[PDB]
Design a protein around this nucleic acid. Sequence first.
RNA 1: CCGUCGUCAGCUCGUGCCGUGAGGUGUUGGGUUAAGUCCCGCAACGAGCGCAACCCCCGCCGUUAGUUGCCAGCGGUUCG
Length: 231
Amino acid sequence: VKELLEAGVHFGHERKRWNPKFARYIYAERNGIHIIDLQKTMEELERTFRFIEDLAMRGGTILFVGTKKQAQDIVRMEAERAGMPYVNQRWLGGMLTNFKTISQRVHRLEELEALFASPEIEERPKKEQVRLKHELERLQKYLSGFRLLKRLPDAIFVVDPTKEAIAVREARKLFIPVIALADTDSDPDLVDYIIPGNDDAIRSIQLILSRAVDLIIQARGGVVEPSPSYA
RNA sequence: CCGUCGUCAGCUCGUGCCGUGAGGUGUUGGGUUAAGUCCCGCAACGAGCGCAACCCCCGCCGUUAGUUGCCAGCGGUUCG
Ligand SMILES: [Mg+2]
Ligand SMILES: [Mg+2]
Ligand SMILES: [Mg+2]
Ligand SMILES: [Mg+2]
Ligand SMILES: [Mg+2]
Ligand SMILES: [Mg+2]
Ligand SMILES: [Mg+2]
Ligand SMILES: [Mg+2]
Ligand SMILES: [Mg+2]
Ligand SMILES: [Mg+2]
Ligand SMILES: [Mg+2]
């Protein structure tokens, strides 16, 4: 499952826009660029996946965090493939720390599902349709992956702990383990299970996500061959 | 019970987040409207009292009804 042709996909980026805590996972600066010791990536995959694999067979949910436009679509395929929740658009404040309240806003979604599946009155004003439809069209935009989540995840898995510091912040306050693919602009000490790698190139996001999705499905009852990606 | 600022676009709440704390946040920000009006954005997410709507008068048309009201037509018409 592990693989070594990762250097055929990322080895890292971003110059002196670095975070000094990450130096322990950096090989050298060549291309005017911080370069990640890929060896140092394997070590942490071994330990991180052990967590994920051990987390797999226990039948426990995982929240998928990626919202930079470089990792936007690629998380949506993969979280569904493993049948687990994600956030694609905005990470709402209090998704975790205020779950019962945020998820009180999925009950409005599930309730819209039914109402627009006929009939429960269509003699409701034309303009109210206009209003309700768009609201469904609005709600749908954000919550499509969060709706699966019906309880606090036993872990969360992140693309950018720097870009999604808020997510990381809530998880911490809820003692939830934090997992993340994360490059040198990020804060290492902040993540429990670290995948020290490029977090912007779609290449790198595909390799590390999918193979982690596969490790999840492998120990969660079955296996399957390849998954969708743009070249 | 009333005047009043003021028919002005405002005033808050629940939870979460922030601050030792008063409190902030949301309610700020772009745009739009008669309006916290609606949109877009966002550690905020919703809820409430207000705005608006629902009620009355007027402007067009219709159905129903035709006296004490009306008279288009015809006939009588002392001439109403
Ligand atoms: Mg990065
Ligand atoms: Mg509060
Ligand atoms: Mg202060
Ligand atoms: Mg406090
Ligand atoms: Mg307060
Ligand atoms: Mg105000
Ligand atoms: Mg205020
Ligand atoms: Mg404004
Ligand atoms: Mg006004
Ligand atoms: Mg309003
Ligand atoms: Mg706001």
